[PDB]
């Protein structure tokens, strides 16, 4: 059901970036690009370390938007508990 997680992630990221980008006084493409978003949902991980390696990511960007991304990624993450031992 990976597609479900990715689809949901992108869907939420669209509204989040839309509201934040609209209020901030900019455009969605001015804050994030199709490629950046694609990789974001594709990776699906709170760890901002791996995200920083994604073209179009900065401390300020992740600090403003990334915050919500990490919160949700950490919330849903707690629900899952794959055997990593």
Swiss-Prot record:
It is linked to Bloom syndrome: An autosomal recessive disorder. It is characterized by proportionate pre- and postnatal growth deficiency, sun-sensitive telangiectatic hypo- and hyperpigmented skin, predisposition to malignancy, and chromosomal instability. The N-terminal region mediates dimerization and homooligomerization. Both the helicase ATP-binding domain and the helicase C-terminal domain form intramolecular interactions with the HRDC domain in a ATP-dependent manner. The HRDC domain is required for single-stranded DNA (ssDNA) and DNA Holliday junction binding. ATP-dependent DNA helicase that unwinds double-stranded (ds)DNA in a 3'-5' direction. Participates in DNA replication and repair. Involved in 5'-end resection of DNA during double-strand break (DSB) repair: unwinds DNA and recruits DNA2 which mediates the cleavage of 5'-ssDNA. Stimulates DNA 4-way junction branch migration and DNA Holliday junction dissolution. Binds single-stranded DNA (ssDNA), forked duplex DNA and Holliday junction DNA. Unwinds G-quadruplex DNA; unwinding occurs in the 3'-5' direction and requires a 3' single-stranded end of at least 7 nucleotides. Belongs to the helicase family. RecQ subfamily. Deubiquitinated by USP37; leading to stabilization in order to sustain the DNA damage response. ATP binds at residue 33. This is RecQ-like DNA helicase BLM. Residues 3-83 form the HRDC domain. It comes from the Eukaryota. It comes from Homo sapiens (Human). It is found in: Nucleus. Residues 18-35 are annotated as: Necessary for ssDNA and DNA Holliday junction binding. Changing residue 28 to A: No change in ssDNA binding. Increased DNA Holliday junction binding. Changing residue 34 to A: No change in ssDNA binding. Decreased DNA Holliday junction binding. Monomer. Homodimer (via N-terminus). Homotetramer (via N-terminus); dimer of dimers. Homohexamer (via N-terminus). Self-association negatively regulates DNA unwinding amplitude and rate. Oligomeric complexes dissociate into monomer in presence of ATP. Part of the BRCA1-associated genome surveillance complex (BASC), which contains BRCA1, MSH2, MSH6, MLH1, ATM, BLM, PMS2 and the RAD50-MRE11-NBS1 protein complex. This association could be a dynamic process changing throughout the cell cycle and within subnuclear domains. Interacts with RMI complex. The gene is BLM.
């Amino acid at each position: 059901q990976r597609e479900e997680m990715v689809k949901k992630c992108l869907g939420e990221l669209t509204e989040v970036c839309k509201s934040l980008g609209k209020v901030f006084g900019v455009h969605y493409f001015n804050i994030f690009n199709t490629v950046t978003l694609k990789k974001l949902a594709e990776s699906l991980s709170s760890d901002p370390e791996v995200l920083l390696q994604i073209d179009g990511v900065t401390e300020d960007k992740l600090e403003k938007y990334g915050a919500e991304v990490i919160s949700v990624l950490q919330k849903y993450s707690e629900w899952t508990s794959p055997a990593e031992d």
